[PDB]
Amino acid sequence: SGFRKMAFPSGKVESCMVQVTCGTTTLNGLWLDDVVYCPRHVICTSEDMLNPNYEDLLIRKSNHNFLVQAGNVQLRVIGHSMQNCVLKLKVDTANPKTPKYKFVRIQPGQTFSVLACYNGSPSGVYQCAMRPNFTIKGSFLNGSCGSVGFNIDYDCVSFCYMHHMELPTGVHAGTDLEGNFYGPFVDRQTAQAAGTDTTITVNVLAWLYAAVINGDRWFLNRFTTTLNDFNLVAMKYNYEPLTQDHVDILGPLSAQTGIAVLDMCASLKELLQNGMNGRTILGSALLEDEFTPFDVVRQCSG
Amino acid sequence: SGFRKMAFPSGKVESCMVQVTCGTTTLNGLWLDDVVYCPRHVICTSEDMLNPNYEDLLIRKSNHNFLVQAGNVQLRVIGHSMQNCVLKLKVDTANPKTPKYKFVRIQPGQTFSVLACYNGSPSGVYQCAMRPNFTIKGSFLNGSCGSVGFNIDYDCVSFCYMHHMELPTGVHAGTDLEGNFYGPFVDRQTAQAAGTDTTITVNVLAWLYAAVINGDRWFLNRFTTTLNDFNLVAMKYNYEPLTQDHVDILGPLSAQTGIAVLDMCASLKELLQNGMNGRTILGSALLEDEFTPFDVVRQCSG
Numbered sequence: 078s079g080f081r082k083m084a085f086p087s088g089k090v091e092s093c094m095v096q097v098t099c100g101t102t103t104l105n106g107l108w109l110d111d112v113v114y115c116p117r118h119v120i121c122t123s124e125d126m127l128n129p130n131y132e133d134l135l136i137r138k139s140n141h142n143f144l145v146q147a148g149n150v151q152l153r154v155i156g157h158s159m160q161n162c163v164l165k166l167k168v169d170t171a172n173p174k175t176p177k178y179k180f181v182r183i184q185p186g187q188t189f190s191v192l193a194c195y196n197g198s199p200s201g202v203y204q205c206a207m208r209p210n211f212t213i214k215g216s217f218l219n220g221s222c223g224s225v226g227f228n229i230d231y232d233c234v235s236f237c238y239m240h241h242m243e244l245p246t247g248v249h250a251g252t253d254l255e256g257n258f259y260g261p262f263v264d265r266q267t268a269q270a271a272g273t274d275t276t277i278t279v280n281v282l283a284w285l286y287a288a289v290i291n292g293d294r295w296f297l298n299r300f301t302t303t304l305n306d307f308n309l310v311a312m313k314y315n316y317e318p319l320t321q322d323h324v325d326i327l328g329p330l331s332a333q334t335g336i337a338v339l340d341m342c343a344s345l346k347e348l349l350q351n352g353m354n355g356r357t358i359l360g361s362a363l364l365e366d367e368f369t370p371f372d373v374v375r376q377c378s379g
Numbered sequence: 380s381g382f383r384k385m386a387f388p389s390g391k392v393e394s395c396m397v398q399v400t401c402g403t404t405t406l407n408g409l410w411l412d413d414v415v416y417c418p419r420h421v422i423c424t425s426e427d428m429l430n431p432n433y434e435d436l437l438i439r440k441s442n443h444n445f446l447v448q449a450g451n452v453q454l455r456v457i458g459h460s461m462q463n464c465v466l467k468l469k470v471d472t473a474n475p476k477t478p479k480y481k482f483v484r485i486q487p488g489q490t491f492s493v494l495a496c497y498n499g500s501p502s503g504v505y506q507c508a509m510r511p512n513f514t515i516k517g518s519f520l521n522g523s524c525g526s527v528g529f530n531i532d533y534d535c536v537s538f539c540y541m542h543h544m545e546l547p548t549g550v551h552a553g554t555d556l557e558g559n560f561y562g563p564f565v566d567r568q569t570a571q572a573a574g575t576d577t578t579i580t581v582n583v584l585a586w587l588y589a590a591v592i593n594g595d596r597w598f599l600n601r602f603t604t605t606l607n608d609f610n611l612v613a614m615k616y617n618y619e620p621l622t623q624d625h626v627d628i629l630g631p632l633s634a635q636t637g638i639a640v641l642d643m644c645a646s647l648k649e650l651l652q653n654g655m656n657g658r659t660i661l662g663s664a665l666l667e668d669e670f671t672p673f674d675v676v677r678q679c680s681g
């Protein structure tokens with residue numbers, strides 16, 4: 078028993094983290110096969126970041142302007158290209174520890190582990206949910222750019238995120254491994270707004286199933302609701318509307334506990350309408366939406 | 380910016396996890412040099428665990444009764460011995476990926492990362508604090524025993540915990556790597572009481588400094604308190620008394636923010652007597668005590 082926010086084991090990804098330096102700017106890079114991926118703003122000075130012309134800035138850089146280090150080994154840069162907001166540096170050595178991998182673009186509501194790195198050295202791991210407004214609540218200091226987000230399915234590493242910046246609100250933004258930002262953000266030091274956010278309804282329900290599995294049942298009630306009635310309440314409390322596809326995704330948890338999705342929706346409706354009134358669920362005084370149904374099943378089975 | 384509960388990168392420990400089977404019972408083992416460390420109840424059947432005589436049970440086992448698998452490779456056991464609640468299996472092969480390590484006994488209030496494992500295979504990583512009543516709030520299912528807790532200091536892994544059992548309150552209990560239980564617990568399937576817990580005062584203070592560093596200041600003011608007067612209030616709210624040694628440990632965070640320890644104590648004393656009043660601190664409606672002063676320094680400057 079016990080339910081905790083858990084990251085994937087990071088060993089496979091630690092073996093791909095390298096340090097990338099261009100002039101006086103140092104950040105992290107991801108070394109897969111003979112290519113090192115990193116944020117393109119590695120070519121910027123602090124002054125350039127206010128209004129960069131990346132195309133012109135890169136034209137002034139040669140392969141020798143990029144120093145890539147894996148541990149204490151210099152990887153010779155023999156080619157460079159920019160794809161969206163990502164810089165791809167071709168190096169003279171293939172990473173011998175390149176795991177089986179894919180580059181994926183995750184959907185809002187989905188989770189991933191972030192291996193926070195500085196100077197190409199991993200310092201910590203934590204889980205993030207991609208908010209409906211395409212931001213994440215991370216922990217990133219100066220030099221953390223190039224740190225990656227990923228999921229592991231047995232032996233294959235699905236890289237989904239690369240860290241690029243922090244918004245005025247304190248939340249974080251980045252790209253997929255093709256260098257396309259999640260959200261409307263740009264890699265320029267200028268105030269940018271993330272949209273109004275919403276609560277990930279299906280994740281709240283998955284977390285209530287995790288709570289019941291752990292013996293936290295005080296919120297269970299003898300009522301059942303309907304999908305349409307629950308959606309009237311959801312809109313008022315800024316919760317995403319529940320769809321039949323989300324009800325289907327909750328199937329395995331509903332089956333493991335013998336608690337119907339609409340029985341659990343009546344618990345959620347009551348929690349929203351009356352408030353939690355200082356009470357707790359799985360140690361939390363708030364309804365948590367950062368766990369997917371797959372995260373809950375993965376943890377409740379092994 | 381940002382503050383997140385973060386585990387150490389797990390790669391160095393993943394390379395040490397093995398599967399240990401004895402008869403019908405399978406759990407995890409930790410492979411360092413030519414020794415495999417695992418919980419001694421691997422020699423128990425379900426009925427044996429009710430009231431085991433471990434010495435008698437171990438007499439009945441030989442080296443060939445222990446099946447040890449590192450991935451898809453069997454490691455031959457050539458010696459065995461029991462040290463407290465841990466079984467030490469000498470194997471014919473030294474782990475070629477043994478990191479630089481040490482075995483440490485952690486103090487209550489300190490934190491460590493847990494690499495949760497099943498059948499010798501890592502599944503996830505999360506941070507735990509050793510509660511003042513010597514329990515941890517983890518996530519462990521059947522077969523999780525033998526999973527270890529650790530801290531990493533640059534290249535050295537300090538192993539401090541090995542999982543053995545779950546208590547009636549849903550909390551977890553285990554030993555150091557020498558097999559000595561943390562707390563008054565025994566490796567027997569019998570009802571066992573964990574003592575009354577207390578809040579780790581120095582850790583709440585460290586987290587309040589992390590909140591200030593991240594922009595929260597509503598709880599700050601010019602009021603102060605003596606070390607003695609704060610302790611009179613702390614005792615009422617089941618918080619540990621704050622000592623001058625704890626005040627000294629908070630010194631680096633106090634210097635960084637320019638907020639004296641007793642000034643933060645006055646804010647904490649105020650937060651306990653007056654409540655938060657609908658507000659949050661670092662995305663939480665409750666005061667958190669699972670971050671040490673070192674955990675905060677690591678993220679809020681490191």
Ligand SMILES: *C(=N)[C@H](C[C@@H]1CCNC1=O)NC(=O)[C@@H]1[C@@H]2[C@H](CN1C(=O)[C@@H](NC(=O)C(F)(F)F)C(C)(C)C)C2(C)C
Binds near residue numbers: 104
């Ligand atoms: C990469 N190493 C850092 C990570 C930042 C540092 C503090 N917390 C983080 O997540 N990325 C940057 O410094 C990027 C970089 C220029 C400016 N920058 C920012 O994150 C800035 N934010 C923005 O300009 C904004 F609002 F648009 F997101 C900063 C004010 C420094 C936090 C570029 C090229 C985006």
Ligand SMILES: *C(=N)[C@H](C[C@@H]1CCNC1=O)NC(=O)[C@@H]1[C@@H]2[C@H](CN1C(=O)[C@@H](NC(=O)C(F)(F)F)C(C)(C)C)C2(C)C
Binds near residue numbers: 519542
């Ligand atoms: C080792 N793989 C498991 C881990 C347990 C399984 C469920 N959650 C866990 O963390 N350890 C055990 O099953 C140990 C083992 C016998 C009984 N046991 C327990 O944890 C039981 N608890 C106790 O009897 C108690 F309360 F005293 F701690 C159980 C009821 C199965 C949760 C031995 C030898 C201690």
